[PDB]
From a paper:
Multiple transcription factors can bind together to a regulatory element in a cooperative way, and cooperation between the pioneer transcription factors OCT4 (also known as POU5F1) and SOX2 is important for pluripotency and reprogramming. Here we present cryo-electron microscopy structures of human OCT4 bound to a nucleosome containing human LIN28B or nMATN1 DNA sequences, both of which bear multiple binding sites for OCT4. Our structural and biochemistry data reveal that binding of OCT4 induces changes to the nucleosome structure, repositions the nucleosomal DNA and facilitates cooperative binding of additional OCT4 and of SOX2 to their internal binding sites. OCT4 has two DNA-binding domains: OCT4-POUS and OCT4-POUHD.
Focused classification and refinements improved the resolution to 2.3 Å in the nucleosome portion and to 8.1 Å for an approximately 20-kDa OCT4 region bound to the linker DNA. We performed MNase sequencing to determine the position of the nMATN1 DNA on the OCT4-bound nucleosome and combined that information with the cryo-EM map to build a model for OCT4 bound to the nMATN1 nucleosome. Our structural and MNase sequencing data revealed that, despite the presence of multiple OCT4 motifs in the nMATN1 DNA, OCT4 predominantly binds to one binding site in the linker DNA, near the nucleosome entry–exit site (mOBS1), a position overall similar to that in the LIN28B nucleosome structure. Both DNA-binding domains of OCT4 engage the nMATN1 nucleosome; whereas OCT4-POUHD is bound close to the nucleosome dyad, OCT4-POUS is located distally from the nucleosome. Of note, the H3 tail from the entry–exit site opposite to the OCT4-binding side interacts with OCT4, in contrast to the LIN28B nucleosome. We found that both H3K27ac and H3K27me3 modifications increased binding of the second and especially the third OCT4.
Numbering used by the authors:
A (entry chain A): 38 to 134
B (entry chain E): 38 to 133
C (entry chain B): 22 to 102
D (entry chain F): 21 to 101
E (entry chain H), F (entry chain D): 29 to 122
G (entry chain G), H (entry chain C): 11 to 118
I (entry chain X): 140 to 220, 238 to 288
Write the structure that this text describes.
Amino acid sequence: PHRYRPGTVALREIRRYQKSTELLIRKLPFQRLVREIAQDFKTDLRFQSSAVMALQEASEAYLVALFEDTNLCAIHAKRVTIMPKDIQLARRIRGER
Amino acid sequence: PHRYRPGTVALREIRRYQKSTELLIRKLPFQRLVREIAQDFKTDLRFQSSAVMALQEASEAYLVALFEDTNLCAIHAKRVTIMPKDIQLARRIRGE
Amino acid sequence: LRDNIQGITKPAIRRLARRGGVKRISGLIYEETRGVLKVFLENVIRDAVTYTEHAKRKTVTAMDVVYALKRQGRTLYGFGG
Amino acid sequence: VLRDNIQGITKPAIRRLARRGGVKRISGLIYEETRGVLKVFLENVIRDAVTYTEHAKRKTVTAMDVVYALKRQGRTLYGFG
Amino acid sequence: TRKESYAIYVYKVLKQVHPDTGISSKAMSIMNSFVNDVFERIAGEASRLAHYNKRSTITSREIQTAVRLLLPGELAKHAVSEGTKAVTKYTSAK
Amino acid sequence: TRKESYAIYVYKVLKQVHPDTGISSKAMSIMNSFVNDVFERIAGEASRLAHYNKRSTITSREIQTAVRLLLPGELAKHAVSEGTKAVTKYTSAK
Amino acid sequence: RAKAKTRSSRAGLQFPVGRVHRLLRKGNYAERVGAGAPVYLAAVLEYLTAEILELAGNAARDNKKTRIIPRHLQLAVRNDEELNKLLGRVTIAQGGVLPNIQSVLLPK
Amino acid sequence: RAKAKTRSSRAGLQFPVGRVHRLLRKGNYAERVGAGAPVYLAAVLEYLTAEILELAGNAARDNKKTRIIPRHLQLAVRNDEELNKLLGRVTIAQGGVLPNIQSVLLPK
Amino acid sequence: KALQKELEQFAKLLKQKRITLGYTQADVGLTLGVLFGKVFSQTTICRFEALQLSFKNMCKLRPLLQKWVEEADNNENLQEIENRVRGNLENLFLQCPKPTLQQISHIAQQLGLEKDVVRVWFCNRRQKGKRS
DNA sequence: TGCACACATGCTAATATATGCACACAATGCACACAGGTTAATATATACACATACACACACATGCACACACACGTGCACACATATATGCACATGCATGCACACACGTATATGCACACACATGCACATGCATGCGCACATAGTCACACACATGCACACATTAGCATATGC
DNA sequence: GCATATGCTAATGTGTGCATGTGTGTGACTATGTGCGCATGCATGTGCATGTGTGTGCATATACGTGTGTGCATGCATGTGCATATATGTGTGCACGTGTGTGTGCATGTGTGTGTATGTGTATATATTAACCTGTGTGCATTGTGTGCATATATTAGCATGTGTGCA
């Protein structure tokens, strides 16, 4: 059976997901996450449908930008796989700590 | 003759300069640099003495904070020596 | 609504990393990413809810999120502000 | 004023700044890179400070002009007014 | 009620630079967001400029200085020309 | 002329927390910058809050919400308690 | 009265001078607003809008599209060095990112 | 009439309530300023001043110093988790840095 | 050319130094082994002093002996301190001149000889039978 | 364990910086009087949450193996520490232009109030560019096969040690 | 009996050929792209209408030009001595290469939870209307605040001691 070598289809996904603009997190689980977090601030909180979409758009943009910075840290360390210390370094330099 | 190992005097200088607060760049050379840069925007500019002092305080604070970020990048690469690519990565992540 | 952070699945985190240009991902990234997103959401939602209280409303609007994001230096376009 | 005053930021001065930043070992190419970074930082601050000075129809750059320029760049400085 | 936006003015500008190109509603919202954002930045900087100089009125001079402070190199130079040209043309016709 | 600063008020606050501790002129300037910076941050946030809600008045409610948005968690809680206590005492006395 | 001429037409602008003047007055920026301040500000806003729309229209034309979508605005802003600086801390909804793969990650 | 007493004494504050009201009115923040707003703002400013000054006075005492200097203000802010967050983008002149050496750089 | 006579003169002087130093040829081989690691047998030293070895071998052992005579003069105390198998293998020939390794292992186990020894002996058997 | 180097410590004079004081004055408070922003109560339309249903694409788990990361070792030249000559920054004064700030008269310009049109937003179709899906060309993967370059091994030549023959 | 000379043959070595391994240059396989055909819903153009920008005087105050005096920034000249630059030696950290285990990617099969549509009841955000309380505005009395000076404290600069760490 045909098998692509490791990293070959990973590069295909990079090209695919950098061409498109759709949200990459499933909408319903993210909506449940937003409501769960807002419970610690209020009870009986309702959300506009566009409010959750705005939160998801900002959340995915923030995470994608973080992964771009995380990737540079991994490459700086002469690696190709991102690790939690790469994320920790990027947030520390960014001041998100 | 007595000779300290490489990095022993460097560690003492780190403790010495992290304890004090004085400006680490000479004042007169920094003032000349400020005036030369400012001449590209206006001719025959004057500076208050505290205006140059404010510039030097911010410039040294900016550079010290950049070196702190640069040092983390060097350590991340399992090094102890900062390199230009360490500065470039820190400024890239900061958004500069 | 209990333990919804696991709704951010491994394939979802991998897709976000692919858009970020990441080629290889360690197995410990997924739990680290969930904690990062959890912290980010708390900061925005806390400010967005604070805007909701001041308006004496019980519904979080898109403008409340937009104002909360703007306050944190994360201006978002396309939702009325 | 003069010309080529970036060399006035000497290697020992750059070393002292690195020591305050906790840097133990410094490569020889750091000093040229540091001078370029400082010049870029000073060009941005001084350009805005002169813009504040020009608007006030003054010929003297004041501490407040530098403070406003630094605040404009997200680098607010205390201790000069 | 009526919700004012810049959509009809953005559409007029779009027909000037691209007469055959349309714009989506989501893209129009982003353009409306961009205009409000830039307006608030310039007006905020101009407001501070009047306060720093102990002035109580915002004039085209304050707007010009705010534009130079907020816009990058070539954008500021061209924006200042458009603002100056419009002001010159405006006062020529009262 | 007369230059206005918070130096005399910062000094009175210092004499309560630390009756036998002085302050240098450079440190007093920093404290003056800190008070002005926090004032501008809170007043700016309160001003935006009134505009968002179609209001023309800055009230203590706008100030209280601005404090919660700008100050970190436990700092905001004590600041809100201090502000509420002062407004209650101010109203009870006048 | 004479025929009512809009200030935008007098200044040769498409953006509303009168609305910008009112927004400045009620925006709590200063107690007075000059006559030329809204004209200058409206012209600057019109110029910046034209810069983005022209670049976004070119991006839409490249992708064989007749309608500008958020993706084209994102491509226009991020591929322009000066626009990218102005909007460096701004997220565009449904804009995506720029295609960029580090050369070290490419196969050799 | 009656003997005039300041609103700061009415609110039990040391920061100038009357001056904060004038700074709010002339600061171009809103058309009107409520009576309670300057009182609330002055109390918050006084509390934040007291928090920093009491921490800075502790740092001065730790250094056998009777006068607070910019170093003591910097030490108080950076050693306090919340105050460091509030002044994260703030540079204190002549404040220095916190003594901090990475353990990897320490001798083996 | 004259390398022949130069070797001969060196060898005569070498014999004189060996006789003067009170070292036997076996002792010379032992000294060469403990000072270089390549211990040589006394037959090689005999064929050297009598000039029997080949020219290439002559030149090859010139330097070691030069070094030994130039070094040992300083201090001496520390420096001092079967036919039936043949017949069976011949019987194994005359029927299969070049056996396989599979048979070689059996032959080695049968006569108790090492595999390498039997292989080299087989090769030299072939060699001397192909001489004629 | 002992030596040499660096930072610290109780110690005394010296000074410049902070502290306290007295005075004018400008801003705060006090007292009205007005008015409009805000509140509150009501009604109304909105759109959010809740449930229900379906189909299906994605998520989850597994098995497999590839290659990446991490440890290890090597060597080298780069950078640290040091010494020495020296350039020059720091401090200190002295003089002078000169720009900045105050003060003031005052016209220009902006807010104010009001009538009134018209430009803008909501609502209404409407048609058209985008999305959806089928087939087909097409760039790319890689895997597979072939060709080339390179070690043991062995074809024959050299080499060197054994058993026994001589000899001192 | 030990130490030399012989005959003789294991053993290697020169030289080499095959055989094996690695690298490079393409059939099958897969996936992205490109038209082609078609329905959808979403953008666009067309009218009501109403709220807002405009035209118009009108009064008012901010800003501006003029002049003023003073701080102050610039330039110069002098002096010590601290820091800088240069060169020398060398330790050690960086980078390179090697190898190995295992973690991660790829692919497969399965089911389940997401996405879409549907509908409904309910909470609620919104808008209208009346009124009233709060903030502004104005003027006057005046007390607190900042300026300018005395005053004396803490801070800073030396000099012997007192550890305290590094380093061989």
